[PDB]
Amino acid sequence: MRVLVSNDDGVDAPGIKILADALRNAGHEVMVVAPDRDRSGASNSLTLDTPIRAKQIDMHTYSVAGTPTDCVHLALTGLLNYDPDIVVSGINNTGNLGDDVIYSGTVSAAMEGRFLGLPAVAVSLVTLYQQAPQYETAAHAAINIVAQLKTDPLPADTILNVNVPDVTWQQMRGFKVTRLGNRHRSAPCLTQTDPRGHTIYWIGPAGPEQDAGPGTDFDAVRNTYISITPIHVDLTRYQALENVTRWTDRLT
Amino acid sequence: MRVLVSNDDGVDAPGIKILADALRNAGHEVMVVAPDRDRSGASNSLTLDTPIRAKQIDMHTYSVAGTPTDCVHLALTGLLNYDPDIVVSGINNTGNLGDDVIYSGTVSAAMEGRFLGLPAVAVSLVTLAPQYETAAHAAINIVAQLKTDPLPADTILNVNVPDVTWQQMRGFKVTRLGNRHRSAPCLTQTDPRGHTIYWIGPAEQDAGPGTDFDAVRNTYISITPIHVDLTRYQALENVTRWTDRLTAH
Amino acid sequence: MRVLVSNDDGVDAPGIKILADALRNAGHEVMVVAPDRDRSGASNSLTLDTPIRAKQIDMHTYSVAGTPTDCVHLALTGLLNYDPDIVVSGINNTGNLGDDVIYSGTVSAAMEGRFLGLPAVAVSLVTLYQQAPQYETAAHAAINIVAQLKTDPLPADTILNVNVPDVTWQQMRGFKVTRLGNRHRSAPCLTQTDPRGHTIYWIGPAGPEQDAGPGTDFDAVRNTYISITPIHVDLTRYQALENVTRWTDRLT
Amino acid sequence: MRVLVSNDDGVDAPGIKILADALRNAGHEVMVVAPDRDRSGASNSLTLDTPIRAKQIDMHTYSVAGTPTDCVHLALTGLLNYDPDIVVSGINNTGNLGDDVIYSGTVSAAMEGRFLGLPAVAVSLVTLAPQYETAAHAAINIVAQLKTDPLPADTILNVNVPDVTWQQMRGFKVTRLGNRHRSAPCLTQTDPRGHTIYWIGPAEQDAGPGTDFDAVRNTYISITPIHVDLTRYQALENVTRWTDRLTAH
Ligand SMILES: [Cl-]
Ligand SMILES: [Cl-]
Ligand SMILES: [Cl-]
Ligand SMILES: [Cl-]
Ligand SMILES: [Mn+2]
Ligand SMILES: [Mn+2]
Ligand SMILES: [Mn+2]
Ligand SMILES: [Mn+2]
């Protein structure tokens, strides 16, 4: 019904506009609070030391000079007289798979969605390489997810990290629940030289042994399956608390 | 043992130097690979699109023009002929508690430590005369304790140290992550130009008993074992049924 | 005839697209090489230490992961088999007046245009404050400037810093040649406090005595005149070389 | 005299400390207002949208969380009860020659010095053991020479120092700005992933006699008097006729 929409690529990004329109046409009351620019490369932390400017484009659309987390946080703490029951973050220009999820700005917005007691979904479009972006397919996926969460909503302890293959909806195989992978386990750092002659290092590409087998988000988007990874909102490993306590007591 | 040391505040930070010296004096073979500048404010992602420069300062001291994750990753993938069994990240100038942990650059380095199959520890000094020696003294005991009984290779330790002397610590407390910005109401002021600016509200929240907030508040060195895999495996069972019912229509 | 177009706000900016279309419809062969994101806040220097990625959107449009100067420089040094006789930089989302010109990324692209021996124009849209951007007016101004430079081109020693009032073309008074101003001469630093209690400083607003009188770019855009400031491409003050030399000899 | 000192490399930079000490020992009342971090890579514009924090380190030493222009601007508009007659910016870790001057953060601080009605000097050390003492020794002579015969209040001095000892300098040379990237052809290589990346070509250009490039090349401390007003007043005469002919149709 009521959806708060944000992203990483900025408010002028085509990914979020198509998503907002798709949700508008789906009968959902949208609410866009997005960064002023593509802040992919800056921290995702809440801006606490400095105040944040929030210019409004039009109704239901606010531009925010700050991190995606700042967007969502402000949007739910006084910036808006709006009470959404779900936060949809996206649609990101690229994909968010494996280790790229923890530091993802798109995911960080959704991460801020749960911290304030709201179900959240991070939607990304796995694009590589001439071609045309399929944000409509990713949006069409989103409008079905939000609708399915209306009937029987998933537990208030996780968010959905959704990644969409950059293709058409007919070519799309379907949906699969996947776990996060690990692309750069055996990434062998290559050493080349700049024109100046100094030594520069490249982070190695996907090695022979990489965590991208079946059941991982990498595999799903590889075989044209819209990946859905339920990820933690609490980094605390509660199943390790029992062991570390004994370890700490022997150290205390 | 062999210890790889990194941070967030940069290689010229006093937090990492005191830590490296403390580990040196503790009989551990240290190895410092740290950012060139304080990159608190930039992304923590691995730099893939551009190559990374790595200037060496001295014996086992490397300045890296890139993220803390780039430091650790390179240091274990060819930059060094060094095989450490533990990665100690710190000591950060500030603290890393609750929601500030997921986006922490200090923690991100340690996070990169486990991804390559190495136990990792993020050490921070909760400051608001920085007592880095106390945080370092805590670290040298943790790494030593991991020699006998090492961590299970599935989690890293997020350690935060109260900015005081060692004679004021009442011990260590295993805690979880808190959430101070639960329902923190934002405030609205104006700039000298009059344009409307928004402040993120100050500290209803999660900072009670068992939290790392309450830990470092009572002068206890907080130790939070955190996930290295964001995947909520205990939710995979339910989402699958939810997804199958969605696939139908 | 042949125009190279760049900006500061990124390749996905509406300012550059409308400009490119206006130049396309004007019978000019356009060529867009723009940053991948809004790099307003990063340095304008040429990226020398690291290599630059240049993804192509479509023909005549290349996205560049680097500074506006990197865009123009590469576009004229091998990235393209294209030989434009003019470099139009814009249209920037904001204005570039007075001291904001030296550090302007939009102007920096045009600045790179002259360094390689090409006439260059920086076009900006003075926007303040609900409202609708008038990029079309700024573009309509640009297509007349480029056309006028076809007949009798301005000398190859300067570039044009053009700023357009955010209004319609009919409301527009006309064009005026102006000099750069100085908004923050007597800007009195105000001192307030953050919620935490620490002391923060605000850079003072336009004081009573500010260089924005008649003949300055500020005044033109104030009275709905499209400002045109011919600015230096060589920072060297050649009229001071005669004095400093005597001063240096007395020091040598 | 009263000297306001700033830089680009940050307040913890060795370049500015040696400069400040040299000016202190020269009998000048110094005043250091420098960025908190090395902001080479960020914009030089005045921070207007957000407020600026200014932590004080010691007596006449202020760390500013903002651009070099923010440092100088604040330092002359209320942050300090200090009225210097000259602003010395440096000493930058690298050199500032030709087209690298307009976007230089070191120069931007000095540029902010003139905008508020104060003579300003940008001092850089052309490095490719950093000889900051030589660059500082050059600076203390320049500021002293400006006491007797001050600069005309319309330009600032862009000073660049060869990274050598003082016993190797053949003197000072007043030069102009060069242009090494005139027609430098870019090169095309590939990343390990195979995707096409572009390198900006190395040094037909402008670095001959009279240029600051050729100056610091022959171990001469280059002094380039640069504009503070980008307006080309000698072009105002022609553009006006060009604009009037454009206004007609
Ligand atoms: Cl992202
Ligand atoms: Cl941190
Ligand atoms: Cl700009
Ligand atoms: Cl510089
Ligand atoms: Mn993004
Ligand atoms: Mn830090
Ligand atoms: Mn811009
Ligand atoms: Mn510098």
Side-chain angles (χ1 to χ4, degrees):
Chain A
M1 298 296 299
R2 310 199 211 192
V3 183
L4 173 67
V5 186
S6 185
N7 76 93
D8 192 346
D9 321 318
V11 72
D12 294 325
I16 186 175
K17 296 218 63 178
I18 298 180
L19 174 61
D21 293 337
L23 293 175
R24 272 184 173 89
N25 307 332
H28 299 283
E29 185 183 0
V30 309
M31 180 62 252
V32 171
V33 181
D36 60 331
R37 66 175 63 94
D38 199 336
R39 306 188 75 91
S40 294
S43 182
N44 295 334
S45 297
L46 283 177
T47 305
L48 304 182
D49 296 338
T50 63
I52 311 167
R53 296 188 181 272
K55 181 181 179 181
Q56 180 174 9
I57 299 183
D58 78 313
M59 301 307 297
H60 300 329
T61 310
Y62 283 79
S63 186
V64 167
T67 74
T69 51
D70 296 327
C71 295
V72 180
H73 189 84
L74 292 187
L76 301 174
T77 54
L79 156 62
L80 308 171
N81 308 93
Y82 194 78
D83 182 28
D85 208 343
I86 189 182
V87 175
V88 176
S89 186
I91 303 170
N92 194 74
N93 64 331
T94 59
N96 297 120
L97 310 169
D99 300 334
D100 302 325
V101 179
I102 326 180
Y103 308 138
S104 173
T106 301
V107 175
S108 72
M111 190 69 65
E112 194 67 16
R114 180 51 235 165
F115 288 161
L116 280 74
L118 296 180
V121 176
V123 184
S124 305
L125 185 66
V126 187
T127 60
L128 298 180
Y129 308 146
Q130 301 179 181
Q131 292 183 332
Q134 297 271 178
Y135 290 114
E136 287 76 1
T137 304
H140 187 198
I143 67 182
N144 290 277
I145 294 178
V146 178
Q148 192 73 12
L149 290 181
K150 179 181 180 180
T151 62
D152 184 74
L154 294 183
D157 61 339
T158 179
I159 69 175
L160 295 178
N161 183 28
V162 180
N163 300 267
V164 180
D166 191 37
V167 297
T168 60
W169 185 262
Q170 182 58 35
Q171 189 179 180
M172 189 67 64
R173 299 273 200 89
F175 297 88
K176 281 185 176 180
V177 175
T178 63
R179 61 175 180 86
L180 296 181
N182 199 323
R183 187 194 302 102
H184 305 285
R185 283 193 186 186
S186 59
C189 168
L190 300 189
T191 295
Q192 70 176 231
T193 57
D194 50 44
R196 284 78 189 178
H198 301 78
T199 311
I200 60 180
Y201 300 154
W202 279 97
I203 293 190
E209 182 65 21
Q210 49 174 323
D211 189 17
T216 66
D217 46 11
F218 292 100
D219 190 87
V221 296
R222 188 98 63 177
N223 297 274
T224 322
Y225 280 92
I226 297 176
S227 176
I228 298 184
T229 314
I231 65 177
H232 284 291
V233 299
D234 193 347
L235 274 62
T236 302
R237 186 167 181 83
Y238 293 87
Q239 50 182 337
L241 291 175
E242 194 170 343
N243 187 24
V244 183
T245 303
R246 304 179 179 96
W247 175 91
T248 296
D249 286 332
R250 293 188 297 268
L251 181 60
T252 301
Chain B
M1 64 172 56
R2 305 181 186 90
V3 181
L4 174 67
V5 186
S6 185
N7 76 93
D8 192 347
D9 321 318
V11 72
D12 294 325
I16 186 175
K17 296 218 63 178
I18 298 180
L19 174 61
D21 293 337
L23 293 174
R24 278 187 175 96
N25 307 332
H28 300 283
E29 185 183 1
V30 311
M31 180 62 253
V32 171
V33 181
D36 61 331
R37 69 222 296 172
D38 198 334
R39 306 188 76 91
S40 300
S43 182
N44 295 334
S45 298
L46 283 177
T47 305
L48 304 182
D49 296 338
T50 63
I52 311 167
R53 296 188 182 272
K55 181 181 179 181
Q56 181 174 9
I57 305 180
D58 58 84
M59 302 299 299
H60 271 204
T61 305
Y62 287 80
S63 180
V64 165
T67 75
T69 51
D70 296 327
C71 295
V72 180
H73 189 84
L74 292 187
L76 301 174
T77 54
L79 157 63
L80 308 171
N81 286 328
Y82 194 79
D83 188 30
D85 50 320
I86 189 182
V87 176
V88 176
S89 186
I91 303 170
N92 194 74
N93 64 331
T94 59
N96 297 120
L97 310 169
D99 300 334
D100 302 325
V101 179
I102 183 171
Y103 309 137
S104 173
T106 301
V107 175
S108 72
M111 190 69 65
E112 192 70 7
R114 179 51 235 165
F115 288 161
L116 279 74
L118 296 180
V121 176
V123 184
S124 304
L125 184 66
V126 187
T127 60
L128 211 167
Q131 302 292 340
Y132 290 114
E133 287 76 1
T134 304
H137 187 198
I140 67 182
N141 290 277
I142 294 178
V143 60
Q145 192 73 12
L146 290 181
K147 180 180 180 180
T148 64
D149 181 32
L151 290 175
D154 62 337
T155 176
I156 69 174
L157 295 178
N158 183 28
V159 180
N160 300 267
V161 180
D163 191 37
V164 297
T165 179
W166 185 261
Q167 202 63 28
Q168 287 180 4
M169 297 297 178
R170 286 186 172 182
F172 306 148
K173 282 187 174 180
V174 180
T175 53
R176 60 179 176 90
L177 293 185
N179 196 329
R180 60 176 179 178
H181 294 352
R182 185 67 181 271
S183 60
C186 74
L187 300 188
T188 295
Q189 309 172 353
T190 58
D191 50 44
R193 292 178 175 84
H195 289 276
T196 312
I197 60 180
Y198 300 155
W199 279 97
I200 293 190
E204 186 176 12
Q205 65 185 25
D206 198 341
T211 66
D212 54 341
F213 282 95
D214 188 89
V216 296
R217 183 178 181 179
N218 293 268
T219 322
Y220 280 92
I221 297 177
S222 175
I223 298 184
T224 314
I226 65 177
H227 285 291
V228 305
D229 193 347
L230 288 192
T231 302
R232 187 170 186 87
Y233 293 87
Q234 50 182 337
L236 291 175
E237 177 186 348
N238 187 32
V239 183
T240 303
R241 299 187 190 90
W242 175 91
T243 296
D244 286 333
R245 292 188 299 267
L246 179 56
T247 319
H249 187 271
Chain C
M1 298 296 299
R2 310 199 211 192
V3 183
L4 173 67
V5 186
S6 185
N7 76 93
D8 192 346
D9 321 318
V11 72
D12 294 325
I16 186 175
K17 296 218 63 178
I18 298 180
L19 174 61
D21 293 337
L23 293 175
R24 272 184 173 89
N25 307 332
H28 299 283
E29 185 183 0
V30 309
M31 180 62 252
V32 171
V33 181
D36 60 331
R37 66 175 63 94
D38 199 336
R39 306 188 75 91
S40 294
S43 182
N44 295 334
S45 297
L46 283 177
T47 305
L48 304 182
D49 296 338
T50 63
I52 311 167
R53 296 188 181 272
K55 181 181 179 181
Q56 180 174 9
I57 299 183
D58 78 313
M59 301 307 297
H60 300 329
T61 310
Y62 283 79
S63 186
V64 167
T67 74
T69 51
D70 296 327
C71 295
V72 180
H73 189 84
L74 292 187
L76 301 174
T77 54
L79 156 62
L80 308 171
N81 308 93
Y82 194 78
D83 182 28
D85 208 343
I86 189 182
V87 175
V88 176
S89 186
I91 303 170
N92 194 74
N93 64 331
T94 59
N96 297 120
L97 310 169
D99 300 334
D100 302 325
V101 179
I102 326 180
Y103 308 138
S104 173
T106 301
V107 175
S108 72
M111 190 69 65
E112 194 67 16
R114 180 51 235 165
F115 288 161
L116 280 74
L118 296 180
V121 176
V123 184
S124 305
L125 185 66
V126 187
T127 60
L128 298 180
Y129 308 146
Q130 301 179 181
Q131 292 183 332
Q134 297 271 178
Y135 290 114
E136 287 76 1
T137 304
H140 187 198
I143 67 182
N144 290 277
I145 294 178
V146 178
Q148 192 73 12
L149 290 181
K150 179 181 180 180
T151 62
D152 184 74
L154 294 183
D157 61 339
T158 179
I159 69 175
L160 295 178
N161 183 28
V162 180
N163 300 267
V164 180
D166 191 37
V167 297
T168 60
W169 185 262
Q170 182 58 35
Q171 189 179 180
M172 189 67 64
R173 299 273 200 89
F175 297 88
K176 281 185 176 180
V177 175
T178 63
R179 61 175 180 86
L180 296 181
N182 199 323
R183 187 194 302 102
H184 305 285
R185 283 193 186 186
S186 59
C189 168
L190 300 189
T191 295
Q192 70 176 231
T193 57
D194 50 44
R196 284 78 189 178
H198 301 78
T199 311
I200 60 180
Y201 300 154
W202 279 97
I203 293 190
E209 182 65 21
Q210 49 174 323
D211 189 17
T216 66
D217 46 11
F218 292 100
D219 190 87
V221 296
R222 188 98 63 177
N223 297 274
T224 322
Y225 280 92
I226 297 176
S227 176
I228 298 184
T229 314
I231 65 177
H232 284 291
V233 299
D234 193 347
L235 274 62
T236 302
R237 186 167 181 83
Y238 293 87
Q239 50 182 337
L241 291 175
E242 194 170 343
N243 187 24
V244 183
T245 303
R246 304 179 179 96
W247 175 91
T248 296
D249 286 332
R250 293 188 297 268
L251 181 60
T252 301
Chain D
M1 64 172 56
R2 305 181 186 90
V3 181
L4 174 67
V5 186
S6 185
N7 76 93
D8 192 347
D9 321 318
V11 72
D12 294 325
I16 186 175
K17 296 218 63 178
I18 298 180
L19 174 61
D21 293 337
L23 293 174
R24 278 187 175 96
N25 307 332
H28 300 283
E29 185 183 1
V30 311
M31 180 62 253
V32 171
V33 181
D36 61 331
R37 69 222 296 172
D38 198 334
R39 306 188 76 91
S40 300
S43 182
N44 295 334
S45 298
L46 283 177
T47 305
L48 304 182
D49 296 338
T50 63
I52 311 167
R53 296 188 182 272
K55 181 181 179 181
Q56 181 174 9
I57 305 180
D58 58 84
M59 302 299 299
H60 271 204
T61 305
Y62 287 80
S63 180
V64 165
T67 75
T69 51
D70 296 327
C71 295
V72 180
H73 189 84
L74 292 187
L76 301 174
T77 54
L79 157 63
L80 308 171
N81 286 328
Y82 194 79
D83 188 30
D85 50 320
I86 189 182
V87 176
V88 176
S89 186
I91 303 170
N92 194 74
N93 64 331
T94 59
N96 297 120
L97 310 169
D99 300 334
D100 302 325
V101 179
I102 183 171
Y103 309 137
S104 173
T106 301
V107 175
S108 72
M111 190 69 65
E112 192 70 7
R114 179 51 235 165
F115 288 161
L116 279 74
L118 296 180
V121 176
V123 184
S124 304
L125 184 66
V126 187
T127 60
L128 211 167
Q131 302 292 340
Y132 290 114
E133 287 76 1
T134 304
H137 187 198
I140 67 182
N141 290 277
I142 294 178
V143 60
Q145 192 73 12
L146 290 181
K147 180 180 180 180
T148 64
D149 181 32
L151 290 175
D154 62 337
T155 176
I156 69 174
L157 295 178
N158 183 28
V159 180
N160 300 267
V161 180
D163 191 37
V164 297
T165 179
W166 185 261
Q167 202 63 28
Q168 287 180 4
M169 297 297 178
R170 286 186 172 182
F172 306 148
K173 282 187 174 180
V174 180
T175 53
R176 60 179 176 90
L177 293 185
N179 196 329
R180 60 176 179 178
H181 294 352
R182 185 67 181 271
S183 60
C186 74
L187 300 188
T188 295
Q189 309 172 353
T190 58
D191 50 44
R193 292 178 175 84
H195 289 276
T196 312
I197 60 180
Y198 300 155
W199 279 97
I200 293 190
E204 186 176 12
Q205 65 185 25
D206 198 341
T211 66
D212 54 341
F213 282 95
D214 188 89
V216 296
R217 183 178 181 179
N218 293 268
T219 322
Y220 280 92
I221 297 177
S222 175
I223 298 184
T224 314
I226 65 177
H227 285 291
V228 305
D229 193 347
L230 288 192
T231 302
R232 187 170 186 87
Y233 293 87
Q234 50 182 337
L236 291 175
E237 177 186 348
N238 187 32
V239 183
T240 303
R241 299 187 190 90
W242 175 91
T243 296
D244 286 333
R245 292 188 299 267
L246 179 56
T247 319
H249 187 271

